[PDB]
Amino acid sequence: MNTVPFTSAPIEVTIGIDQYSFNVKENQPFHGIKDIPIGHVHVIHFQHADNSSMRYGYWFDCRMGNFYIQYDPKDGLYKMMEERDGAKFENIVHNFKERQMMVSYPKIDEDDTWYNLTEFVQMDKIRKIVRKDENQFSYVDSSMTTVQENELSDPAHSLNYTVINFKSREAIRPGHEMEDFLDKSYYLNTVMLQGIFKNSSNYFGELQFAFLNAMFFGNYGSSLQWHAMIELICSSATVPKHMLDKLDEILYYQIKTLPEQYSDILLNERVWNICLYSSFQKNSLHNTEKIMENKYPELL
Amino acid sequence: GAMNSSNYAELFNNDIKLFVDDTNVYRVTVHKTFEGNVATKAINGCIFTLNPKTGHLFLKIIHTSVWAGQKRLSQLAKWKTAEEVSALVRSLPKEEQPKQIIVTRKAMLDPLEVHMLDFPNIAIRPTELRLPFSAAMSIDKLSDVVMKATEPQMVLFNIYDDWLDRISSYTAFSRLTLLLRALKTNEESAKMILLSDPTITIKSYHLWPSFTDEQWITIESQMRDLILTEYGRKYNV
Numbered sequence: 119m120n121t122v123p124f125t126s127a128p129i130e131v132t133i134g135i136d137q138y139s140f141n142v143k144e145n146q147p148f149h150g151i152k153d154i155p156i157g158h159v160h161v162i163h164f165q166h167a168d169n170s171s172m173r174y175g176y177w178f179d180c181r182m183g184n185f186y187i188q189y190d191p192k193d194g195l196y197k198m199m200e201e202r203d204g205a206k207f208e209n210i211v212h213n214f215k216e217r218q219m220m221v222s223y224p225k226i227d228e229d230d231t232w233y234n235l236t237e238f239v240q241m242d243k244i245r246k247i248v249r250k251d252e253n254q255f256s257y258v259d260s261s262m263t264t265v266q267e268n269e270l271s272d273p274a275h276s277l278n279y280t281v282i283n284f285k286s287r288e289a290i291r292p293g294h295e296m297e298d299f300l301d302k303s304y305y306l307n308t309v310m311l312q313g314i315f316k317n318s319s320n321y322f323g324e325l326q327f328a329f330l331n332a333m334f335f336g337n338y339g340s341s342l343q344w345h346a347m348i349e350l351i352c353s354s355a356t357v358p359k360h361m362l363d364k365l366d367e368i369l370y371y372q373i374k375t376l377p378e379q380y381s382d383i384l385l386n387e388r389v390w391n392i393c394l395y396s397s398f399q400k401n402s403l404h405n406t407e408k409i410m411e412n413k414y415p416e417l418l
Numbered sequence: 419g420a421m422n423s424s425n426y427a428e429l430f431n432n433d434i435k436l437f438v439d440d441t442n443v444y445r446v447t448v449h450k451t452f453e454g455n456v457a458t459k460a461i462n463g464c465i466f467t468l469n470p471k472t473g474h475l476f477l478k479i480i481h482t483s484v485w486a487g488q489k490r491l492s493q494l495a496k497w498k499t500a501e502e503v504s505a506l507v508r509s510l511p512k513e514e515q516p517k518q519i520i521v522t523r524k525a526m527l528d529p530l531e532v533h534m535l536d537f538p539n540i541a542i543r544p545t546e547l548r549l550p551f552s553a554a555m556s557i558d559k560l561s562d563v564v565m566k567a568t569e570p571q572m573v574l575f576n577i578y579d580d581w582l583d584r585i586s587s588y589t590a591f592s593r594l595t596l597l598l599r600a601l602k603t604n605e606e607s608a609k610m611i612l613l614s615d616p617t618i619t620i621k622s623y624h625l626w627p628s629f630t631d632e633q634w635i636t637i638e639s640q641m642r643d644l645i646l647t648e649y650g651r652k653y654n655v
C-alpha cells in the first residue's frame with residue numbers, strides 16, 4: 119500500500135482519488151492519501167471551491183516513483199512532483215502517518231470497481247497519449263483538446279488519442295467503399311488492431327482511459343474518443359468473441375459508475391441507440407443493454 | 419452547405435458544378451406471383467447528372483444486369499450511383515472536373531462522400547430545393563435510350579437544346595424545371611401541350627420542340643396553368 123503526501127492544502131478544494139472524493143477546507147491540516155492499492159494506475163484530481171472551471175488531475179502508478187502534491191501559488195494549482203530522495207519522502211510519509219493527517223483510500227474489500235475500470239489501462243500507454251516525458255505521471259484537465267479536435271491549438275497540451283474517422287481513406291479501402299463503410303471489420307481488425315494498437319488489450323486500455331478522462335474531467339474530446347471506439351467495434355460484423363464479451367464487461371462497469379446526473383452530457387444518444395439496437399453487435403452486449411435500459415431508459 | 423432559394427444564383431456562376439439525381443437508378447414493377455405472393459422485376463434505370471450552367475447531361479444508363487444476385491437493392495443503388503459519379507469525375511480532364519456536386523436526395527451524401535475521398539476539394543452538398551428531375555424519364559428520347567439499352571452505357575445530351583443561344587442559364591434552368599414539374603404533376607396533359615401543334619417539330623439532335631420565343635411564352639404559361647390546376651384538382655381549390 120502506497121502513499122501520496124500533500125505539503126499543505128492552502129486553498130479549499132474537492133480532491134478526488136479514483137472514484138472517491140472529499141472536500142478539504144482552506145488551510146485545513148490535510149497531508150495526503152495513504153493505503154493506495156498497488157497494481158493499478160490511479161488518478162488524483164482537483165476542483166477548486168472558488169472556480170469549478172477546470173477540473174484537473176494526475177495519472178500515476180506508485181510503482182514508478184514516490185509522488186507528492188504541493189500547491190503552487192503562482193500557477194494557482196495543486197501540482198504533482200516526484201521525490202528522488204527515498205529517505206526524505208519516507209520520513210515525510212511516516213511523520214504525517216503518525217500524526218494521522220492523511221485520509222485512507224477507502225476501498226471496500228468486496229469492491230472491484232476500480233480494477234474493472236482500469237483493467238487494460240497502463241501508465242506507459244497513458245504517457246504516450248499525454249506527452250510530457252520529464253515526468254512519470256500525467257496531467258489532464260477539462261479543457262485539453264485532442265489531436266483530432268485540433269485538425270478540425272497548442273500541440274504540447276494535446277491528448278494524442280488514436281485518430282478514428284469513418285469517412286477517411288484509412289477507414290475505406292479503394293474499391294470496397296460500400297463494404298467497408300457499412301461493415302467496419304477491416305478498419306477494426308486490420309488497420310486498428312493488427313496495425314496500430316497491436317492487440318485488443320491496448321485498444322481497450324485507450325477506450326477505458328478516454329472514458330475516465332470524460333468522467334473525471336468532463337473532457338469533451340475524450341468522450342468523443344470513447345464513443346468512437348465503441349462505435350467502431352459495434353459497427354463491425356466480424357469481431358473476436360473474446361473482445362465482444364470483454365467489451366460488454368467494460369461498458370457495464372463504465373455505465374454503472376457514471377453519475378446519474380451527468381448522463382445528459384456524457385452519453386451520445388445516437389451512438390448508444392445504434393450500438394444496442396441497430397448494429398451488428400446489437401445482441402452481443404447483454405449486460406450493458408440491461409444496465410442502460412434500467413438506469414437510462416430516457417436516452418433510449 | 420445546403421443549396422436553397424437564398425443561394426440560387428450560385429448555380430449559374432462560373433464554378434463548375436453538377437446536380438446528381440438518383441431517383442431513376444433502381445426502377446421496378448411490382449407484380450403477383452403464381453402462388454399469389456408479390457415480387458418485383460427491375461427495369462433499366464439511369465443516373466441523371468446535370469451541369470445547370472451549360473445544360474450538359476451525363477445520362478449513365480443502369481442496366482438491370484447490375485442488380486443480378488445482389489441484396490438490398492435500394493441501398494446498393496445509392497452506392498452504385500456514387501461509384502458511377504466518381505468514375506465520371508475521374509474520367510474528366512482536371513479543368514472539367516466539378517468543384518461541387520449537389521445531390522437531390524440527402525441519402526446520397528455519405529455514399530458520394532466516401533467514393534470521392536480522393537477528391538477532398540470537391541464539395542458534396544445537399545439541397546433544400548424539391549427539384550423535379552425524377553420526371554426525366556418523361557422526356558421521350560431519354561426514356562427510349564434507357565429502355566433500349568442492352569448493357570451499361572453513358573449517353574451525353576444537352577438538356578437545353580440550343581436555348582442558350584437566346585436565353586441565359588438562369589432562364590434555361592427555370593424553363594427546364596417548369597417543364598419537368600409539369601411532366602411530373604400531369605404527364606399526359608404536359609405532353610399534350612408540347613405536341614398539340616403538329617407544325618412544331620423536335621429536331622433530330624434535340625429533346626424538346628423548336629418553339630419560337632413567343633411560342634415558348636405560350637407554352638410556359640400553359641405549363642403553369644397545368645401545375646396550378648393539378649394543385650387544385652389535388653387539394654380541391
Ligand SMILES: COCCOc1ccc(Br)cc1[N+](=O)[O-]
Nearest residue numbers: 123124125186187201206207210
Ligand atoms: C524542493 O523541496 C522538495 C521537498 O520535497 C518534499 C516536499 C514536500 C513533501 Br509533502 C514531500 C517532499 N519530499 O518527499 O521530499
